[PDB]
């Protein structure tokens, strides 16, 4: 009966993973009707594909082995191991690819998914000579050797690398659709680490100093948790299934420009106009320096030139003409500063 219970748990895990990832892939395919080859779609699609490979070659072998008393089948006997390890590498390499893409999204304006796939495939090639006939043994010391290799390549090294990349991501963010997608990738990383930490912890333990099925189950739960996190974050797939500091400086300088415009339009004489335009000049140069740069600084060139025209009119005693020249600043602001403010939805 306990064997049947283990069979039931494994079959349920297989169902959850295969169904969630197939549904996410179907939602992405349906979005494909709109030409939405968005960068995030291919990454999460191949992440779900990696979770599908995991489900098909981690749970199914386990199910077939729990039935009768071994994985009946030698070429396939080791091929299963190869594919399994392929999925084990991909389950973190796709997250690393996503974190790299989120880094890029706030940097200079597919290849990395194929890079992750190539790593997950090549780094599993030893499984085609480690395991061989009855059932397959990993004979050859070999325990700490391959255990350390697997624990580092699959879990520890990509965890620290992705941590460094996420620190770089906050580095560029700190210096908000991208922030939301960064948070999604962060939740994916956290779930991956929590699911897989005890697995390699005890593997290395046995490796240097000599009930695993519970850890296999908890680890495999990550490949069903990921797609639902993505569905929670991504509005398109959810529908189908049913910079910062520079921006703050820009906001401060634009608020200063607006307050100076308020001072100008209510001004009575040339002196207040000149003072407010002086503050306008300072604020506009400061904003022109900050990054949301060709059309940005060009728009601020126009703003400063209009401020200068208003200053020339004010110095000649033409207060009202200076006020009109300052009113042109509202037109320039609406033309350019609003577009630059729109960058806050990307952050």
């Amino acid at each position, epitope marked *: 009966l306990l064997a049947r219970a283990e069979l039931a748990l494994l079959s349920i895990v297989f169902v959850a993973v295969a169904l969630s990832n197939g549904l996410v892939l179907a939602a992405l395919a349906r979005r494909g009707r709109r030409g939405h080859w968005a960068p995030i779609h291919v990454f999460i699609g191949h992440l779900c594909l990696a979770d599908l490979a995991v489900a098909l070659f981690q749970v199914l072998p386990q199910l077939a082995w729990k039935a009768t008393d071994r994985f009946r089948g030698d070429a396939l006997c080791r091929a299963v191991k190869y594919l399994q390890m392929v999925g084990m590498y991909a389950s973190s390499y796709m997250i690393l690819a996503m974190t790299l893409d989120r880094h890029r999204a706030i940097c200079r304006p597919n290849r990395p998914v194929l890079v992750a796939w190539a790593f997950s495939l090549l780094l599993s090639l030893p499984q085609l000579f480690i395991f061989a006939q009855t059932d397959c043994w990993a004979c050859f010391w070999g325990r700490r050797t391959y255990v350390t290799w697997i624990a580092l390549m699959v879990f520890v090294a990509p965890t620290l690398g992705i941590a460094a990349c996420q620190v770089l991501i906050f580095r560029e963010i700190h210096a908000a659709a991208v922030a939301k997608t960064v948070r999604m990738t962060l939740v994916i990383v956290v779930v991956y680490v929590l699911c897989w930490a005890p697995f390699f912890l005890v593997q290395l333990w046995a490796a240097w100093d000599p009930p695993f099925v519970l850890l296999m189950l908890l680890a495999s739960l990550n490949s069903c948790t990921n797609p639902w996190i993505y569905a929670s974050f991504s509005s398109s797939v959810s529908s189908e299934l049913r910079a910062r500091r520079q921006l703050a400086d820009l906001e401060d300088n634009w608020e200063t420009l607006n307050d100076n415009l308020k001072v100008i339009e209510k001004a009575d004489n040339a002196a207040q106009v000149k003072d407010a335009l*002086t*503050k306008m*000049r*300072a604020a506009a*140069l400061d904003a022109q320096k900050a990054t949301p740069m060709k059309d940005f600084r060009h728009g601020f*060139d126009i703003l*400063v*030139g209009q401020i200068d025209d208003a*200053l020339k009119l004010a*110095n000649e005693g033409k207060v009202k003409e200076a006020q009109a020249a300052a009113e042109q600043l509202k037109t320039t602001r609406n033309a350019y500063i609003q577009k630059y403010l729109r960058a806050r939805s990307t952050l």
Partner: antibody
Amino acid sequence: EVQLVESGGGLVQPGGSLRLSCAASGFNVVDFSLHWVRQAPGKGLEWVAYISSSSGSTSYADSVKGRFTISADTSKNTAYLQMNSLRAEDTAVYYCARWGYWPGEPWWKAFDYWGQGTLVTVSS
Amino acid sequence: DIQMTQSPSSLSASVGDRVTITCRASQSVSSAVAWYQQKPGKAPKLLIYSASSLYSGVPSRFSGSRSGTDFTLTISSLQPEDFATYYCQQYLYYSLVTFGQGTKVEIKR
């Protein structure tokens, strides 16, 4: 070669009517606004006035408003500062300086060229 | 409207010393501050513009710096040619030009 050459100084009475001439070479007075800056002997630099010979007005410091007048000639490529009702307090060395127009580097490189000083002495 | 203030009116240093002069603008101005070097009997010569940029032809040992309304001129290693007067100015607009009081670098003995 870019240069500013000031002339027309010397000794005048405390009644003014002294005209200083700043000739320009290399950079035309049309392309750059021209400023006169005053330095009393033993004292620091004090801005006096400026003119945009091609696109705008003339501005003066509060210390000289009502007395100094700046003009320019774009065909002689020169600028003039006329000082009336000069006082002994205005005895100083006067410098003619360039300043470019917004936008670009020419505006940021304020007073790239000062030419030379011309001494104006006001005493009875 | 905008006043420039300098504290180190008299700076005594020997050849090779690294020297620093400060200048504060009275308003929340942009990087429109400049540094000039003047020798007695000669017109001032531009050293620093944009409050951080080295003017073409100026020896590389000069360096400017901006922190809000405080601006700094440094000489990495004083030469005997650098014992002169130095001025800071605010050049926010043509009608707003104002200079500091000036600082003089003299030989430490």
